[PDB]
Amino acid sequence: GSHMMFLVVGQGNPGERYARTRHNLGFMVLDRLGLSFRPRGEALVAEAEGGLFLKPLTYYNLTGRAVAPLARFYKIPPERILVVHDEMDLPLGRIRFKAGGSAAGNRGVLSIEEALGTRAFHRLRLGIGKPPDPSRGAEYVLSPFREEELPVVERVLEAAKEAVWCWVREGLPPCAGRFNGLDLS
Amino acid sequence: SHMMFLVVGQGNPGERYARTRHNLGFMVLDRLGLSFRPRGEALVAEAEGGLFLKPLTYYNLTGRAVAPLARFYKIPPERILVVHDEMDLPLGRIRFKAGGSAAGNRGVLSIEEALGTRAFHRLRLGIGKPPDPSRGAEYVLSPFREEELPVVERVLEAAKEAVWCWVREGLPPCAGRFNGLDLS
Amino acid sequence: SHMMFLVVGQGNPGERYARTRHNLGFMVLDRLGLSFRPRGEALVAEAEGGLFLKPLTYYNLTGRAVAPLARFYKIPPERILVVHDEMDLPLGRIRFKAGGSAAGNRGVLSIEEALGTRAFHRLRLGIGKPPDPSRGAEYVLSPFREEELPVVERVLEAAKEAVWCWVREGLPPCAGRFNGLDLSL
Ligand SMILES: Nc1ncnc2c1ncn2[C@@H]1O[C@H](COP(=O)(O)O)[C@@H](O)[C@H]1O
Ligand SMILES: Nc1ncnc2c1ncn2[C@@H]1O[C@H](COP(=O)(O)O)[C@@H](O)[C@H]1O
């Protein structure tokens, strides 16, 4: 039988309340992949291309609970885990791959770091911009996008879908080389 | 099993030619971050659902490496981009062109002959004109001068971006963004 | 230049770091007897068809020197050896390791992140750890204690031998000759 070779994890929160918030951009990418998600453990899980795509149902800062058991079961190394998430440290229109390093305060990234015991999983950072002050971060990410931002969101979603498949096929450095410098604004 | 596009770099194979002007197209493909290996009469890399070619045919016979793949995969000419040195543009200029004449470029002519159409796209990378117009073959088979190397570096970084632009967005948006640049 | 391998010594540049525990990798590279010169953000030497590097990046940034070089020369990660001090082994231990976690070593993390893989080789030179982990930065940026220095000499000699071994035979054969040593005995 086959054995799953990679995890692609979309960050978000469960339920209709949160489906259109900036903090669900990772779920919005996973829903653009043409996949068949089904319930498994504490997530919605799709298989494609010999690995797993998941939208955890844990809430955003508890996704590590859903990712780490799957990684351990399948012996999937951090470089074959890609966490797709919104990023306040980049403007909307910018996308960046990153292997490891800081979480920049993103508590979903931190959840997965604690659960795995390593920071060195891969990330696809989807810029959403930042409020005028950092003390407004929770409110900013749990808001929807402004209507005027929607056309850019659509371009980013499309780019991100391409990026995900790039990474699955090629790993991080090649994909970073062609996607990091895009300005979708 | 389905390939959506071909990007073809012009050049001659071998270390002897790797730094020559007529290898500008190879040099751009070598900046894209891909993994090339031998495949037919070419070094080929796969990325983004298409193929990138550095032919092994020599410059003037590149069509022979392009056409089997275009035929097999049913790639229309508008999804083939030929990246090549252009003596009719100065060093520092880059221009997208859809279709049209080969303008004496024997590699471009080889591709037109092999595909049976001019409709394919080109990324023309200016290299300037030799002083003596009878020394054009020798000019393209020489290295860039020391003092041109900084401009070459800018044009390679730009052309790298331009190729990816074309892959994602097609030619009009990218001609919009690049054709006006002057990196000299 | 076709380059068959990269051997990287972890350290920081400058006199004030030269004798610190975190400079064991530089100390091994200086034991090789080679002629290093500046090249990019590194001191570089050539021998046996490959490259030997003391990056000038600082310890936690060495991936920025290593990864572009490896990509330029198409060097697979298993032909990259990183020589470094290791708090998770006692002084006197010398262990080759393929892949695995960085164990918190921020220089090994730099390389893993920049390469986008764990798959490079390491020559782990034990230095022990402080009794409280909250003074780890001071511990690594300290010289060895007086009584430690004779041990360090045995470890540097063995590590020079081990680098030459690995250049020729790579990791398993050389692990078979070095990994059971305890030079504190
Ligand atoms: N770089 C970031 N990208 C996305 N979400 C973030 C980032 N930094 C902070 N957050 C979220 O913003 C909220 C405010 O976090 P804090 O800044 O620690 O007050 C929390 O829900 C974080 O998970
Ligand atoms: N296993 C290790 N070997 C060597 N240096 C380490 C190791 N773990 C942590 N360090 C360094 O120790 C310092 C303290 O690390 P930490 O306690 O994580 O931030 C930093 O400079 C780390 O890079």
Author numbering:
A (entry chain B): -3 to 181
B (entry chain C): -2 to 181
C (entry chain A): -2 to 182
Provide the authors' original text about this structure.
Peptidyl-tRNA hydrolase (Pth) hydrolyzes the ester bond between the peptide and the tRNA of peptidyl-tRNA molecules, which are the products of aborted translation, to prevent cell death by recycling tRNA. Pth releases the tRNA from the peptidyl-tRNA, by cleaving the ester bond between the C-terminal end of the peptide and the 2′- or 3′-hydroxyl group of the adenosine at the 3′-end of the tRNA (A76), and makes the free tRNA available for further rounds of protein synthesis. Pth1 adopts an α/β globular structure and functions as a monomeric enzyme, while Pth2 has a structure similar to thioredoxin and acts as a homodimeric enzyme. Here, we present the crystal structure of Thermus thermophilus Pth (TtPth) in complex with adenosine 5′-monophosphate (AMP), a mimic of A76.
To elucidate the binding mode of the peptidyl-A76 moiety of the substrate, we first determined the structure of TtPth in a complex with AMP by X-ray crystallography. The asymmetric unit of the crystal contains two TtPth⋅AMP complexes (A and B chains) and one AMP-unbound TtPth (C chain). The structures of the two TtPth⋅AMP complexes are quite similar (root mean square deviation for equivalent Cα atoms is 0.38 Å). The structure of TtPth⋅AMP revealed that AMP is bound to an acidic pocket at the bottom of the active site cleft (A−C). In this pocket, TtPth interacts with AMP via 9 amino acid residues (His19, Asp82, Glu83, Met84, Ala100, Gly101, Asn102, Arg103, and Ala134). Furthermore, the N6 atom of adenine forms hydrogen bonds with the side chain carboxyl oxygen of Glu83 and the main chain carbonyl oxygen of Ala100, and the N1 atom of adenine forms a hydrogen bond with the main chain amide nitrogen of Met84. In addition, the hydroxyl O2′ atom of the ribose hydrogen bonds with the main chain amide nitrogen of Arg103. No interaction was observed with the phosphate moiety of AMP. These results indicate that TtPth interacts primarily with the adenine and ribose moieties of AMP, while the phosphate moiety is minimally engaged by TtPth. Likewise, the distances between the gate loop (Asn102) and the lid loop (Val137) in TtPth⋅AMP and apo TtPth are 10.39 Å and 11.03 Å, respectively. These results indicate that AMP binding does not change the structure appreciably. In this research, the structure of the TtPth⋅AMP complex revealed that the adenine ring of the A76-mimicking AMP binds to the acidic pocket in the active site cleft.
